Design a protein around this ligand. Structure first.
Ligand code: FAD
Ligand code: NAP
Length: 524
């Protein structure tokens, strides 16, 4: 059968995909079809329904900003929002802009083959059908594939095995014996939510992490209205900031003030709450200066030692090393360990021997009775959802052979040898990866497509020299941080632009004004 021919294909129905379909169809009038493996929209907020799921950014900012009427209709109950609220918000956006009919849900894109003679992309699905399109927009997230630790004799357990990425909604664990492995952001959130309802909780710790409070407080009607009356100024300042989190970012060097004043600013941020506020709203050299970083790390350690009453229990949860990741927060995570029904096992000192029929025995002889075992282990990286599908550009070159070593890009949204092919939150993009960052990229992509249609452009792609130049820029910015030292969230090659959202917006604007510097344009 002959494929369906459309202007644009969109892959993924999260924040990015929803916005791209709305810009491409409703604004520019282009024919558009979108896909997602999920049975509905939501993206990461469709898949992740574990108890405790929470926004890392505050409620009034964890949403779209492009529509002024939609912002004035928003509502929320606490300073942060849960997964059910975010899912309902994205579902209502889909209905408000009549986007649902443009999507094929429950469908996977299995291949994308560029045909140079026709200057069209051939897209085929796991369910049989075939499309051809002029532009492909990839909003495929960072899901990659779930991680599962193969513990000896796993399929002996007569209980339930649950991974946080596949939580069966409505599952009731009140009154059960539960184990959790994993103490990342997801583990901390699940541990906090389960502990007041379960009969017993056993946390298998491998590497404790730094975490600050979140400060999720109730909100009144008058506060929501105050935010709504200054919405334009609020978004204008967020879009010029570096981390786009709602606070003023400090330029004050940490070791330049007295120890009393340093302790006061740390404590004021800690009482407020916020991972980003603590790392970037207190001083300006926590990520760049050794002594500044140590000061913040040991302040968090002293907070953990005050909270946890048992000193032997505090020791197992005491983090060490550079305070240098994407800043975690929590809603009473440390206090959980003072409950008498919560036990912590340090896997490095007391490793798991192998799991029995109804529990896990460890190497000192103790078997912990468990009804269910929760796996809060992670996934992989950004390139995971790109490398698992057949993507072939000019001369049929595979995306794996093109990114033979490390995922590269030009300005985070394109790559050489792959014309009319764009990435939302791809490699070499900004580390800040929230809605306002998504809006920036989807808006650049939509404008570039409009520019091509108006000026009769048949194919745009970046030059290899422009791509290499962008890689140099991301590595130079990265090598001024402490992150590089040792190995941070990286591939030996950098993986993110760390200049902040405002500097990233200035780069994108300059490229367009300079007549799309870096891109070859094939006319006619
Ligand atoms: C619990 C949690 C809390 C978070 N909180 C924050 C926060 O507050 N701030 C922040 O900045 N970030 C946060 N993040 C992450 C960030 O918001 C997301 O990375 C971002 O929303 C990505 O939006 P997206 O639309 O690009 O991708 P996603 O939401 O990940 O959606 C991508 C979609 O593409 C689909 N897809 C992928 N490959 C294919 C394929 N081959 N065929 C078909 N469909 C495909 C997937 O099914 C998926 O639904 C959080 C993440 C989690 C898990
Ligand atoms: N960008 C944002 O704003 C934002 C916000 C929220 C969430 N997120 C994303 O959410 C993810 C974090 O959630 P997550 O907790 O699922 O991932 P994670 O950060 O990778 O945590 C996985 C946890 O499981 C442990 N673990 C993994 N394999 C193990 C094994 N074989 N044996 C024992 N323990 C094992 C890890 O310990 P070790 O560390 O010792 O290996 C770690 O504690 C990341 O992808 C992050 O980017 C992002």
């Amino acid at each position: 059968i002959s494929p369906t021919v459309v202007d644009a294909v969109v892959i993924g129905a999260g924040f990015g995909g929803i916005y791209a379909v709305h810009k491409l169809h409703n604004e520019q009038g282009l024919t558009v079809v979108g896909f997602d493996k999920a049975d509905g929209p939501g993206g990461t907020w469709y898949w992740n329904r574990y108890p405790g799921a929470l926004s890392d950014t505050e409620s009034h900012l964890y949403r779209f900003s492009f529509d002024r009427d939609l912002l004035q209709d928003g509502t929320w109950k606490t300073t942060y929002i849960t997964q059910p609220e975010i899912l309902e918000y994205l579902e209502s956006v889909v209905d408000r802009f009549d986007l649902r009919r443009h999507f094929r849900f429950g469908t996977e894109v299995t291949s994308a083959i560029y045909l140079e003679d026709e200057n069209l992309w051939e897209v085929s699905t796991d369910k049989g059908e075939v499309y051809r399109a002029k532009y492909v927009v990839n909003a495929v997230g960072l899901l990659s594939a779930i991680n599962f630790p193969d513990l000896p004799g796993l399929d002996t357990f007569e209980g339930e095995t649950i991974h946080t990425a596949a939580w069966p909604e409505g599952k009731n664990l009140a009154g059960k014996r539960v184990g959790v492995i994993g103490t990342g952001s997801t583990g901390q959130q699940v541990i906090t939510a389960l502990a007041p309802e379960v009969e017993h909780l056993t946390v298998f710790v491998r590497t404790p992490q730094y975490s600050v409070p979140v400060g999720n407080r109730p909100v009144t009607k008058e506060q929501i209205d105050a935010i709504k009356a200054d919405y334009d100024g609020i978004w204008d300042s967020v879009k010029k900031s570096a981390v786009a989190a709602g606070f003023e970012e400090s330029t004050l060097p940490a070791m330049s003030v007295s120890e009393e004043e340093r302790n006061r600013i740390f404590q004021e941020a800690w009482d407020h709450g916020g991972g980003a506020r603590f790392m970037f709203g207190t001083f300006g050299d926590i990520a760049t200066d050794e002594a500044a970083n140590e000061a913040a790390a040991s302040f968090i350690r002293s907070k953990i030692a005050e909270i946890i009453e048992d000193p032997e229990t505090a020791r197992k949860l005491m983090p060490t090393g550079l305070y240098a990741k994407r800043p975690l927060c929590d809603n009473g995570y440390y206090e959980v360990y003072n409950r008498p029904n919560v036990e912590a096992v340090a896997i490095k000192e007391n490793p798991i021997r192998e799991v029995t029929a109804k529990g896990v025995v460890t190497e000192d002889g103790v078997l912990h009775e468990l009804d269910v075992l929760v796996f809060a282990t992670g996934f992989d990286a950004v390139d995971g959802n790109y490398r698992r599908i057949e993507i072939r550009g000019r001369n049929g070159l595979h995306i794996n052979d093109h990114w033979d070593g490390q995922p590269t890009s030009y300005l985070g949204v394109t790559t050489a040898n792959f014309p009319n092919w764009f990435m939302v939150l791809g490699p070499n993009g900004p580390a800040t990866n929230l809605p306002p960052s998504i809006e920036t990229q989807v808006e650049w992509i939509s404008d570039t497509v409009a520019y091509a249609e108006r000026n009769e452009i048949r194919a745009i792609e970046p030059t290899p020299e422009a791509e290499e130049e962008w890689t140099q820029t991301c590595t130079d910015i990265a090598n001024a941080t402490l992150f590089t030292r040792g190995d941070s969230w990286i591939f030996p090659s950098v993986l993110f632009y760390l200049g902040g959202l405002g500097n990233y917006r200035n780069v994108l604007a300059g490229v367009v004004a300079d007549s799309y510097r870096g891109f070859e344009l094939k006319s006619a």
